[PDB]
């Protein structure tokens, strides 16, 4: 099991309170109590940021819920505070999640006086953590499976949301890690991995070989498309392209392997052999191009066991004609997976610190 996850973007500390407190004492002549509490709620928000984006990596629902709360909050402050009028005086500075920058200098960083920029990088890190937690799961466990599937789908919908909104909200030119191309590709990757998780669920629940094959076939479409978005690009870490190329072939081999079990059941012995030969070729390709990144050895043995047994009996008993691949029906596609929409609130039991404002 080799899953892709995304590193969180780094940020630097900001005093959210100082510039927010000072811009609350406006309309609101109440230099007394009520108005001067909405200014300690802005202390809670500044502390919340330090919590969401400042603490050393924690990989629990603990740390993700913090992040998602922080995102929820930032979004409900945008009507409260003048920022695409701006107006207020906050600068958020974030490093690019991927571009190391030249060691002939420093990071690739981008400072902007924008709530838009802030929420985008926050959402990014919500997606990235979600992907880390999904990739962490023990997939030999039904609840591990379920947490991976839920989180890959969240991460997919949240990268996609950034794709539709980064440019609108930034005004300026985004950094390449959050730009629509990188992030549309990360969305498709998480969604591929979500599908792969359903394939593994079905494997585990020993479902109908026909079901499993369509689930694997659709995964191969998703992984196919993601590697093709990466073919001419060097934005993501270097392990990403070869993993996606490998998975695209592994997924196709799983499709053919399970479709072969169905053919056999149906006494279509020639078709079984044809599909198994396709599987073995795919898996032979991956074993020789991509061995630094996946271990395909037990699958390969399993295919070779089935193909050796298949050929021996067809030659000695059935004499079925082994058909050509272009003459076989296509394996269908079952998609069980979508990009979770970002609809605030995204956090568990949210309350806006500035609700009655």
């Amino acid at each position: 099991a080799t899953f892709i996850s995304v590193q969180l973007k780094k940020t630097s500390e900001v005093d959210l309170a100082k510039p927010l407190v000072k811009f609350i004492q406006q309309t609101y002549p109440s230099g007394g109590e009520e108005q001067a509490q909405y200014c300690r709620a802005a202390e809670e928000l500044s502390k919340l940021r330090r919590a969401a984006v400042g603490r050393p990596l924690d990989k629990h629902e603990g740390a993700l819920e913090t992040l998602l709360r922080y995102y929820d909050q930032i979004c409900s402050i945008e009507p409260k505070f003048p920022f695409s009028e701006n107006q207020i005086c906050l600068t958020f500075t974030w490093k690019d999640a991927f571009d190391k920058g030249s060691l002939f200098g420093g990071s690739v960083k981008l400072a902007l006086a924008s709530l838009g920029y802030e929420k985008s990088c926050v959402l990014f890190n919500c997606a990235a953590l979600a992907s880390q937690i999904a990739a962490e799961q023990n997939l030999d466990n039904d609840e591990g499976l379920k947490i991976a599937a839920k989180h890959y789908q969240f991460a997919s919908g949240a990268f996609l949301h950034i794709k539709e909104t980064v440019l609108s909200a930034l005004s300026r030119e985004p950094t390449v890690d959050i730009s629509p191309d990188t992030v549309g590709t990360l969305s498709l990757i998480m969604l591929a991995q979500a599908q792969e998780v359903f394939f593994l669920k079905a494997t585990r629940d020993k479902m109908k070989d026909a079901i499993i094959a369509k689930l694997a076939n659709q995964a191969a479409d998703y992984f196919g498309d993601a590697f093709k978005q990466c073919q001419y690009k060097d934005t993501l870490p270097k392990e990403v392209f070869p993993v996606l190329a490998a998975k695209h072939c592994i997924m196709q081999a799983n499709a053919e392997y399970h479709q072969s079990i169905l053919a056999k059941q149906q006494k279509k012995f020639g078709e079984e052999i044809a599909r198994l030969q396709h599987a073995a070729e795919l898996i032979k390709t991956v074993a020789s191009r991509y061995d630094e990144y996946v271990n395909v050895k037990d699958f390969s043995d399993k295919i070779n066991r089935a193909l050796a047994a298949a050929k021996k009996d067809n030659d000695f008993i059935y004499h079925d004609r082994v058909p050509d691949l272009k003459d076989l029906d296509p394996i269908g596609k079952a998609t069980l997976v979508k990009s979770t929409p970002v609809n605030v609130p995204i956090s568990q039991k949210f309350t806006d610190l500035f609700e009655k404002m």
């Binding site: 379920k146 839920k150 789908q153 669920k201 079905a202 479902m207 109908k208 026909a210 079901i211 069980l336």
Partner: peptide, 13 residues
Amino acid sequence: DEEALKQLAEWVS
């Protein structure tokens, strides 16, 4: 065959 498919869709729910 989309019967066992709904009973997969509604697991992650």
